[PDB]
Write a protein that binds this ligand. Structure first.
Ligand SMILES: Nc1ncnc2c1ncn2[C@H]1C[C@H](O)[C@@H](COP(=O)(O)OP(=O)(O)OP(=O)(O)O)O1
Ligand SMILES: [Mn+2]
Ligand SMILES: [Mn+2]
Length: 332
């Protein structure tokens, strides 16, 4: 027996079923491209079960009694075991719709709705987008300008360099302010598509106006290629492309900087650490099993109209009746 919710079981970074999970995640991604959110979540859940298994699935008999393994996901795994290939997955991989939606949605500032609109309008390539600049936001133009670098996996070494410059700027702008690495790198990932940082100060309110000062410092050092600042309407944030110096060269790298007041920091850290499926599952668990609404700002009882005060992620897990999972076991 393995628990049904991803937030009730450890999911390590590395596992024994990478071929099988990858194939299911192609089908999940394709479903998302077609607005089939039910089918996306179904394939995502099945893949996450495989990530949690302590052994490779070598025969279909190892599927019996696992949750989230309905007929379609089981068929995909069966075909892979028997034939080394799943024809449905190969058709998806070869299809122009999938390839194009993958191409467009990978670009900085482009979601599924935009990519689909562009597809329906006859756009297919990055050059097609560059030929229609009136169709692009400034963020998307920046994504296209740096597309090669932004498609290159960000490495832990890049993360360490970026954390140093962000810490230097934060520390010079406001002594005592802190920088916490979040996202997939906090979960132990060796590579990623961006770097996420969470900034706060132990005195509530001292973080006010910090982010623009941090960005000014970084801009002055030549480290910023693109910056879009957004005030809270809901955390203050800056979605950036950094110019990371390397020996004899440089690389553009996506970096998200988020500011949270320290009262909300545990919720923010939990929300921003992911994985995306883990957090979806944790929020579903909270609502369905505990009657509480969890988000990146707090944990709300809608019946009592109360908020839970947490000092740590551990506090939040405890309040929900879940065993604590460190970040490296949230790789659902
Ligand atoms: N730009 C963003 N907008 C909204 N939420 C974000 C953003 N970046 C990160 N988050 C939040 C949502 C997720 O639960 C978590 C991780 O998001 P994201 O950076 O997209 O993936 P990740 O860090 O888990 O993998 P990757 O290594 O590919 O970046 O933090
Ligand atoms: Mn990330
Ligand atoms: Mn991010």
């Amino acid at each position: 027996w393995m628990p049904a919710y991803a937030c009730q079981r450890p999911t390590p970074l590395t596992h024994h079923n990478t071929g099988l999970s990858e194939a299911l995640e192609i089908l999940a991604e394709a479903a998302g491209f077609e607005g089939s959110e039910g089918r996306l979540l179904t394939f995502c859940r099945a893949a996450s079960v495989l990530k949690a298994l302590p052994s490779p699935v070598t025969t279909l008999s190892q599927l019996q009694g696992l949750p989230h393994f309905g007929e379609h996901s089981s068929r995909v795994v069966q075909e892979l075991l028997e034939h080394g290939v799943c024809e449905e997955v190969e058709r998806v991989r070869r299809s122009e719709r999938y390839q194009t939606m993958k191409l467009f949605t990978q670009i900085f500032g482009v979601g599924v709705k935009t990519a689909d609109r562009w597809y329906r309008e006859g756009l297919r390539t990055l050059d097609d987008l560059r030929e229609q600049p009136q169709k692009l936001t400034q963020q998307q133009k920046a994504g296209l300008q740096h597309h090669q670098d932004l498609s290159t996996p960000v490495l832990r070494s890049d993360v360490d360099a970026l954390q140093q410059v962000v810490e230097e700027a934060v520390g010079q702008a406001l002594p005592g302010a802190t920088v916490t690495l979040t996202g997939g790198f906090r979960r132990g990932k060796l590579q990623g598509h961006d770097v996420d940082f969470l900034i706060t100060h132990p005195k509530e309110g001292q973080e006010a106006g910090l982010l623009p000062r941090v960005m000014c410092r970084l801009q002055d050092q030549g480290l910023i290629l693109y910056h879009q600042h957004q005030h809270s309407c809901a955390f203050e944030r800056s979605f950036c492309i950094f110019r990371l110096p390397q020996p004899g060269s440089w690389k553009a790298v996506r970096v998200d900087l988020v500011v949270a007041p320290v009262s909300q920091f545990p919720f923010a850290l939990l929300g921003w650490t992911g994985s995306k499926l883990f957090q979806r599952e944790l929020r579903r668990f909270s609502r369905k099993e505990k009657g509480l609404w969890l988000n990146s700002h707090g944990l709300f009882d809608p019946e009592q109209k109360t908020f839970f005060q947490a000092a740590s992620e551990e506090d939040i897990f405890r309040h929900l009746g879940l065993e604590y999972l460190p970040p490296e076991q949230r790789n659902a």
